[PDB]
Amino acid sequence: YLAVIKVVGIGGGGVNAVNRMIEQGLKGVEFIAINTDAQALLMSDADVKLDVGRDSGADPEVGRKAAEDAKDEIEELLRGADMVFVTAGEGGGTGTGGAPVVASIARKLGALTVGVVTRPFSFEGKRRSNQAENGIAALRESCDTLIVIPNDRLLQMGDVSLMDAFRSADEVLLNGVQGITDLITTPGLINVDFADVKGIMSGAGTALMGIGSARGEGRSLKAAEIAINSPLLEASMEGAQGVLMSIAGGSDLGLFEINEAASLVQDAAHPDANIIFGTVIDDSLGDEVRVTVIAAGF
Amino acid sequence: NYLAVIKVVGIGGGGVNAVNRMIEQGLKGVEFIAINTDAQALLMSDADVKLDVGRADPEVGRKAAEDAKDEIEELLRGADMVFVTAGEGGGTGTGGAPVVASIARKLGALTVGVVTRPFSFEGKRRSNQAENGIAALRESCDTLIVIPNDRLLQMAVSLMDAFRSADEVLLNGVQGITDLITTPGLINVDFADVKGIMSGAGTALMGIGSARGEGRSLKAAEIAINSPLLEASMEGAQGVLMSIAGGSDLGLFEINEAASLVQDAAHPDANIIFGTVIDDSLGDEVRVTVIAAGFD
Ligand SMILES: Nc1nc2c(ncn2[C@@H]2O[C@H](COP(=O)(O)OP(=O)(O)O)[C@@H](O)[C@H]2O)c(=O)[nH]1
Structure with missing residues (x-):
């Protein structure tokens, strides 16, 4: 069995992580970028790009509704996969609210469904932390396995500016996907x-x-x-x-x-x-x- | 027109995705047109020509396409042959496809629809909308190629294999003819x-x-x-x-x-x-x- 693996980055952080995976040469997978910003998606190097929520602010309920409104299209894009990764930075709107929808579709279809997400840095504020906690609880119910990476612990590794910190988060999301898919x-x-x-x-x-x-x-x-x-x-x-x-x-x-x-x-x-x-x-x-x-x- | 001008139109999310598959597989010799019909979402495409008339229901896609009929006509004018497909799944593309087909045929193009019947295990959404989509597309096309996905299970198939097989044969619905x-x-x-x-x-x-x-x-x-x-x-x-x-x-x-x-x-x-x-x-x-x- 030649397994078909798809990697979905959803929201700003997830799409940036997928871009990093592409730049570093992760092979053997199809990259799917889902976001609510068409200009950011034009810059993405993903194989598949879906702009959701077009008629519809870090509000996870908006992100959930945008993904649910697009559920037939997401299902069309995932059909045929043996394995789906759903990657996002938790705490915003699009990824927090939409990642469980993507994962649920992949799981309904029987794909081995692996979430790989970050918890936000504590300096991003309590609303983002609370939103991430709820998004992780939701995603955990829709995934086979949910890998959660605490961004705070990245600051105990490596050397660092804000842009540097989020590049390290991109890299650890890549490490989590590639560590499995390259097997x-x-x-x-x-x-x-x-x-x-x-x-x-x-x-x-x-x-x-x-x-x-x-x-x-x-x-x-x-x-x-x-x-x-x-x-x-x-x-x-x-x-x-x-x-x-x-x-x-x-x-x-x-x-x-x-x-x-x-x-x-x-x-x-x-x-x-x-x-x-x-x-x-x-x-x-x-x-x-x-x-x-x-x-x-x- | 001693090089037949063939245009392949993917409409709605499934049809755009099908066209993207054709491009990735290197289908040669045809012009690809991606028409997005959904207001709420846009599947991006590497097609030559793209038209976003959305601004999931067959009647919604029909009106989106009808409202853009002048723009669609200008995209199609000059073609000897137009393929139209909403690909796998339903949605707004099923309503838009017969509009595009009707425009192509009124232009004089040989108009070939390609439509899939879903696997029976997918269930059925209301009003017999899928079969109404086939009937509407048939009325607007010269030839309607119907792919009954259920028959793929007779060609032990896994569920992922079944979905991949459906995608592959839909691509063949176009490429087998255009390559010839x-x-x-x-x-x-x-x-x-x-x-x-x-x-x-x-x-x-x-x-x-x-x-x-x-x-x-x-x-x-x-x-x-x-x-x-x-x-x-x-x-x-x-x-x-x-x-x-x-x-x-x-x-x-x-x-x-x-x-x-x-x-x-x-x-x-x-x-x-x-x-x-x-x-x-x-x-x-x-x-x-x-x-x-x-x-017969
Ligand atoms: N890996 C990564 N994470 C990011 C990046 N920018 C922001 N984040 C993290 O992702 C969380 C959600 O932000 P973002 O993805 O922009 O929000 P969304 O688009 O609304 O889902 C933030 O709270 C940050 O912890 C990035 O460039 N890369």
């Missing part, structure tokens, strides 16, 4: 295919992600240690009952290194965790390896 | 003979077949003629179009075997248009499309 589209020595991913992500519920990267001697152990200690995982890894871990490297990434990383992750996980390890070939990476952990159930 | 006209092969056709079987023909059905290796042309042609999408309309059809696509190496003998088979299968009084299409990207595969129009 399917560009596997390495340890092949974790669509059926395996569906096995662990179907109905898994809320999830967190951690990412790490390293180079040179001991890179895989270091990358895995960084990933499982990631601030984005909220010190929660030991409580997860389901863990998907992908390690990406060049063609020469060897079984010994892979196994070193897997063993570290096993030792850190809950005694009863179901953990699936997969590898990715990415010949652009040079001497670097990148470990992505998705932790769910919990 | 626009892309050279060993056996080429006169557009006048295409017009001869499709003008005023009414409903048509399509069959598709593919095969590889020895005997591939006969094999693919047998599959196409027996396709469940033709609903055994083949024996009674009074007009038959058949195109064989394959590489430049397709041999005259195997081509002629496939042509002989379709003549044997067709009604004795059928008009039959036959030709081939050189598509060197197919490798050793051949792809046959049969269009059966009219009836």
Whole structure:
């Protein structure tokens, strides 16, 4: 089965994240941008662009109505997918209100439905935080798995201006999608295919992600240690009952290194965790390896 | 007009999406027109010509199109052949399609509608609006190619496969014919003979077949003629179009075997248009499309 994967970015933040995914060369997926601004969509490099809410301000009820009014068109665009990602920055109107509609359509159609969203920075204000909380609750009900990335924890990583901060958010949304899709589209020595991913992500519920990267001697152990200690995982890894871990490297990434990383992750996980390890070939990476952990159930 | 001017109009979200699929797959030799009919949403398109007359209901799309009839006419003027489709799903496109078709035909273009019947498992929305859409489009077209998606389940299909299959055959509803006209092969056709079987023909059905290796042309042609999408309309059809696509190496003998088979299968009084299409990207595969129009 050659899986058909679609990645939907909805609202300003989601469409910007999708643009970043395109710029960084994420392959094997169809990119769909949904927003309420036709000029912003003209700039997007997505394969499919839908402008919603045309007759209808950070009001999630407006975003929900705009998506619901477009539900036949969204369903037309998603029909045939085996897997749909719905990506957004939570806390605004279009993404907050519309993402559960998109996800519900994908789930009704039986696609493995993965949400990947951010919680807003605390400095964006209490209304955005409250709106994101409600949007996440709604989205969680419409997704198989919902990966939630707390933007506040990004400020504990990396170097930083406001534009820089939101570029880092774009990048972590990319990392969350690509960490999963590259297992399917560009596997390495340890092949974790669509059926395996569906096995662990179907109905898994809320999830967190951690990412790490390293180079040179001991890179895989270091990358895995960084990933499982990631601030984005909220010190929660030991409580997860389901863990998907992908390690990406060049063609020469060897079984010994892979196994070193897997063993570290096993030792850190809950005694009863179901953990699936997969590898990715990415010949652009040079001497670097990148470990992505998705932790769910919990 | 010794290069037939063919315009392919996608109207509504499903029809625009279908046109976008055709562009992505590199359908050559035709002009693409994307007409958005919804006020509340716009599906963007890479088509050459775009018209947003919206400013989900068949009557809404009909009035949107009627209100823009002068602009649509100017887009279509000069065409020898116009395809019109609302693609998969319903909505406002189902109301707009017969307006565009009526304009094309009043202009003198050979007007070919393409319409899908949804899978039975999709259910049915009220007033028999889908079948009313087919009847309205039929009344406005020279030939209406009807694709019954239910028959795809006879060609073990998964739900995602079923939806992808429907999209692929809709694309073939256009490309099988336009390639025969626009892309050279060993056996080429006169557009006048295409017009001869499709003008005023009414409903048509399509069959598709593919095969590889020895005997591939006969094999693919047998599959196409027996396709469940033709609903055994083949024996009674009074007009038959058949195109064989394959590489430049397709041999005259195997081509002629496939042509002989379709003549044997067709009604004795059928008009039959036959030709081939050189598509060197197919490798050793051949792809046959049969269009059966009219009836006994
Ligand atoms: N990844 C990313 N997130 C953003 C960006 N701009 C804003 N955000 C986040 O996304 C949330 C929603 O804003 P936005 O997507 O513009 O609102 P919407 O268009 O109404 O859904 C904001 O509160 C920010 O946390 C961006 O450029 N990239």
